[PDB]
């Protein structure tokens with residue numbers, strides 16, 4: 001898994017075309033979204049991750065929760081972004097993992113938004129440009145699931 | 147070299163704190179920028195790249211031009227972004243490659259802009275949400 005964390009003034013998106021044969025079904029309310037004061041997590045689920053979806057999910061939750069706490073962000077936004085890596089996991093695995101991360105972060109008490117998986121989106125972001133405003137992590141499973 | 151290409155309505159930046167001991171010397175004018183209708187090229191120069199700075203520059207220039215032509219962008223903005231990779235080049239090498247990338251795209255007739263190197267920067271970008279508007283590439287020498 002590759003994660004790119006952008007501490008932002010806002011994040012907005014507009015659902016445009018479908019980018020997969022199997023996109024996440026979406027409601028009308030999900031076509032557009034916007035969130036202010038927000039740790040935006042751009043995430044590519046990698047092929048390596050398919051080995052243990054739960055381990056990398058847990059690890060992504062912990063890691064992102066920590067950057068949010070040291071930048072004082074109460075809002076986090078999970079943003080599917082296949083473009084952060086070259087050895088990409090299969091959509092279905094990626095969709096699963098992005099949800100566990102998302103739900104994982106909600107369970108921690110944060111205010112979490114998400115953009116729909118499987119679509120091209122217009123997006124706006126405004127990076128704060130602090131030392132801690134731009135961070136990346138590579139998170140891989142250390143051992144296969146049971 | 148990792149390259150992330152974002153066809154945007156605009157790109158806008160503001161230099162904040164220095165992120166290296168020796169950041170690229172810049173003018174006051176260079177402290178803020180903006181460019182519109184722009185292919186934005188976020189680039190991380192990687193350690194592997196040090197083996198052939200000219201070869202990697204060349205295929206980066208060619209690759210970025212190709213997308214710029216597909217996307218119909220006349221404006222290209224070169225945006226140094228270390229966080230596209232964890233396996234980075236040394237700053238001196240990173241700047242050499244970025245300079246070549248800049249001048250190579252300037253050579254070809256694009257309206258080319260850059261952000262200052264060695265700094266933390268606040269930035270704004272609006273991605274057009276088109277199929278071709280987000281593209282990434284790994285570009286690595288083969289001596």
Ligand SMILES: NCC(=O)N[C@H]1[C@@H](O)[C@H](n2cnc3c(N)ncnc32)O[C@@H]1CO
Nearest residue numbers: 019044045080081082089094117118119
């Ligand atoms: N809006 C820019 C975009 O990235 N669109 C992506 C993601 O929404 C999603 N996607 C597919 N595979 C993956 C993956 N392995 N990891 C993360 N997302 C994925 O499917 C789209 C087409 O690849």
Ligand SMILES: NCC(=O)N[C@H]1[C@@H](O)[C@H](n2cnc3c(N)ncnc32)O[C@@H]1CO
Nearest residue numbers: 165190191226227228234235240264265
């Ligand atoms: N956006 C904010 C930022 O990334 N700031 C980075 C880059 O401008 C630059 N930098 C250093 N090394 C590299 C490299 N190998 N490739 C690209 N840029 C580099 O130095 C800053 C601190 O690492």
